[PDB]
Amino acid sequence: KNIFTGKRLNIFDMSLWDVEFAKQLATVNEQPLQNGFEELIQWTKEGKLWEFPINNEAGFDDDGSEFHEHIFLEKHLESFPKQGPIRHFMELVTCGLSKNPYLSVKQKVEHIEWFRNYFNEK
Amino acid sequence: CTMIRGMVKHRAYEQALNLYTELLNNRLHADVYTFNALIEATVCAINEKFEEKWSKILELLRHMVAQKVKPNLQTFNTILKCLRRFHVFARSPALQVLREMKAIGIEPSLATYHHIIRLFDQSFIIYDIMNELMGKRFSPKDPDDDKFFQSAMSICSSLRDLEL
Amino acid sequence: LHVDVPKDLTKPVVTISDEPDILYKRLSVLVKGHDKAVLDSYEYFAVLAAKELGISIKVHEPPRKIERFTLRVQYEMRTLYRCLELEHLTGSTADVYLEYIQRNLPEGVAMEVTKTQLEQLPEHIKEPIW
Amino acid sequence: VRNPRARVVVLRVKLSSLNLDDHAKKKLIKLVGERYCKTTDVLTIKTDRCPLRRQNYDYAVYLLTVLYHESWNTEEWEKSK
Amino acid sequence: ADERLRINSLRRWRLSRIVFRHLADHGQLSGIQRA
């Protein structure tokens, strides 16, 4: 008969220490690289190599913004003159900013706020 | 608990045990790793025979069930590693440890079989251990798992049996 | 390996999700390189791989360009092109094929892949607003 | 890996597939201007304003949506054709 | 900088020619051959 049948104890039925315990567990299967595919796999797991198929906007999300924040920036013009020549200048400014693909929403908003300030001192 | 674990980690078994008794006197409860530390300390304690050391380990297990702490893989593996130090007298207790480890539902690791094989090698269990392990895929569960195959092959060398 | 072989191999996990996949009418792959032989070998590789992946592929050669400039000492750049138009492939087939051929992209060869996804009208455009 | 040219998205739809009447088709065509090719009956909206590509795709869909709705609308000045 | 741009609103290898030649002439600049 197998060793798996027989008498048993019958006793029971059904921080830093953890970190280093897991790091020591990692060493159990820590072998040297066995070929080139394994090297590429290890590098991409480490974040070394590019992801394929290549995504030209990988790792970039523009702060999760949506298009209507980039195209419709006229809600930042509420505190300005609504019908004078600053309305003209600032509406055209925000039209310019809405066509800028290189800036995020935050920089555009800060720029609009700077004009807010500058006109208010003046 | 942390003092106990570090205390054993640096081989200070006697006052490790004394501080455990102090812990009990303060009506406090110990953690599984602390119990494993304490088992290792009990076995490495000097001037005691096999039987009283085994009784002390059993007493520790009765405490384990007393404070509602459930044993895990590391506890049984430590028990078997300690039992390795007592050669022939420890064989049936090691087998009983393995059977209880299965009955509780804790899957044996590679380190378990490493300890068992090295304990009995001082030998036909390897047939059974292997007939269990054939076809199975394993994961790192014990630091000593990497020592299995080596020890396993040693048996094959000692037994001069090629099919193993 | 003649006797010593791996007993079993852990195939990668490919789970059939529940979402519908993108459909591509066309997938045009414009590879630009400084060497015609490199582009010819890459064309052979890509076309073969498409054949064993079942994807319908056609190849043509867009005209080469030269950029000449002078410092008299006159230097030259040649750019040669190869266009691989794949047709009627799903999102996953396209994705795996592109991963393969981009990981196997040789030196000095840049890639431009245009993907022509197929979509249906938004529900806002099936009828006018009343 | 960043290439600024990857944000561009091009939406192409044949106007015959849009539920348009005569007035709506006329209005749509002479709204879009050169984006519509008479030979092919295809309207092509190229969006590159937004940094990302998902944002430009959403903007293109939004443009087509508003274009359809404003072509199917008859203002007061529309009376004096 | 940005302040300067705002007030305004309110109103190939980057090497020396010779170092280019040595790298270009030695084949160290990819794709740049001599006509």
Swiss-Prot record, chain A:
Where is it localised?
Mitochondrion
- Give an example GO biological process: mitochondrial translation
Membrane keyword on record: no
Keywords on record: Mitochondrion, Ribonucleoprotein, Ribosomal protein, Transit peptide
MF terms (GO), sorted A to Z: protein domain specific binding; RNA binding; structural constituent of ribosome
Q: Name one GO cellular component term.
A: mitochondrial small ribosomal subunit
Q: How does it assemble?
A: Component of the mitochondrial small ribosomal subunit (mt-SSU). Mature mammalian 55S mitochondrial ribosomes consist of a small (28S) and a large (39S) subunit. The 28S small subunit contains a 12S ribosomal RNA (12S mt-rRNA) and 30 different proteins. The 39S large subunit contains a 16S rRNA (16S mt-rRNA), a copy of mitochondrial valine transfer RNA (mt-tRNA(Val)), which plays an integral structural role, and 52 different proteins.
Q: Which family does it belong to?
A: Belongs to the mitochondrion-specific ribosomal protein mS31 family.
Name of the protein this chain belongs to: Small ribosomal subunit protein mS31
Instruction: State the organism of origin.
Output: Homo sapiens (Human)
- The UniProt gene name for this protein comes to MRPS31
From the entire protein, which fragment is shown?
A: 248 to 383 of 395
Swiss-Prot record, chain B:
Report which superkingdom the organism of origin falls in. Answer: Eukaryota
Show which residues constitute the signal peptide.
none
Q: Which residues form a coiled coil?
A: none
Start-end of each PPR repeat:
1-30, 31-71, 72-108, 109-142
Tissue occurrence: Abundant in testes, skeletal muscle and heart tissue.
What are the subcellular locations of this protein? Mitochondrion
What is this protein's function per UniProt? Mitochondrial RNA-binding protein that has a role in mitochondrial translation.
Family assignment from sequence similarity: Belongs to the mitochondrion-specific ribosomal protein mS39 family.
Related disease?
Answer: Combined oxidative phosphorylation deficiency 51: An autosomal recessive, mitochondrial disorder characterized by intrauterine growth retardation, low birth weight, poor overall growth, progressive limb rigidity, delayed psychomotor development, hearing loss, and optic atrophy. Brain imaging shows abnormal bilateral signs at the basal ganglia and brainstem. Patient cells show decreased mitochondrial complex I and IV levels and activities, and generalized mitochondrial translation defects.
Assembly mode: Component of the mitochondrial small ribosomal subunit (mt-SSU). Mature mammalian 55S mitochondrial ribosomes consist of a small (28S) and a large (39S) subunit. The 28S small subunit contains a 12S ribosomal RNA (12S mt-rRNA) and 30 different proteins. The 39S large subunit contains a 16S rRNA (16S mt-rRNA), a copy of mitochondrial valine transfer RNA (mt-tRNA(Val)), which plays an integral structural role, and 52 different proteins. Associated with the 12S mitochondrial rRNA (12S mt-rRNA).
From Swiss-Prot, chain C:
Question: Which GO cellular component does the record give, naming just one?
Answer: mitochondrial inner membrane
**Keyword terms of this UniProt record:** Mitochondrion, Ribonucleoprotein, Ribosomal protein
Looking at the record's lineage, which domain of life comes first?
A: Eukaryota
Give its localization. Answer: Mitochondrion
Q: Which GO terms describe its biological process?
A: mitochondrial translation
Q: Does the keyword Mitochondrion apply?
A: yes
Q: What is its main location?
A: mitochondrion
Residue runs in coiled coils: none
Q: Does the keyword Mitochondrion apply?
A: yes
Provide the disulphide bond pattern.
none
Family, according to the entry, reads as follows: Belongs to the universal ribosomal protein uS10 family.
Subunit and partners? Component of the mitochondrial small ribosomal subunit (mt-SSU). Mature mammalian 55S mitochondrial ribosomes consist of a small (28S) and a large (39S) subunit. The 28S small subunit contains a 12S ribosomal RNA (12S mt-rRNA) and 30 different proteins. The 39S large subunit contains a 16S rRNA (16S mt-rRNA), a copy of mitochondrial valine transfer RNA (mt-tRNA(Val)), which plays an integral structural role, and 52 different proteins.
Name of the protein in question = Small ribosomal subunit protein uS10m
- Recorded source organism is Homo sapiens
Name the gene for this chain.
Answer: MRPS10
Curated annotation (Swiss-Prot), chain D:
Q: Where in the cell is it found?
A: Mitochondrion
Domain of life per record: Eukaryota
Species this chain originates from: Homo sapiens
According to the record's subunit comment, the protein's assembly and interactions are: Component of the mitochondrial small ribosomal subunit (mt-SSU). Mature mammalian 55S mitochondrial ribosomes consist of a small (28S) and a large (39S) subunit. The 28S small subunit contains a 12S ribosomal RNA (12S mt-rRNA) and 30 different proteins. The 39S large subunit contains a 16S rRNA (16S mt-rRNA), a copy of mitochondrial valine transfer RNA (mt-tRNA(Val)), which plays an integral structural role, and 52 different proteins.
Write out the similarity annotation.
Belongs to the mitochondrion-specific ribosomal protein mS35 family.
Q: What is this protein called?
A: Small ribosomal subunit protein mS35
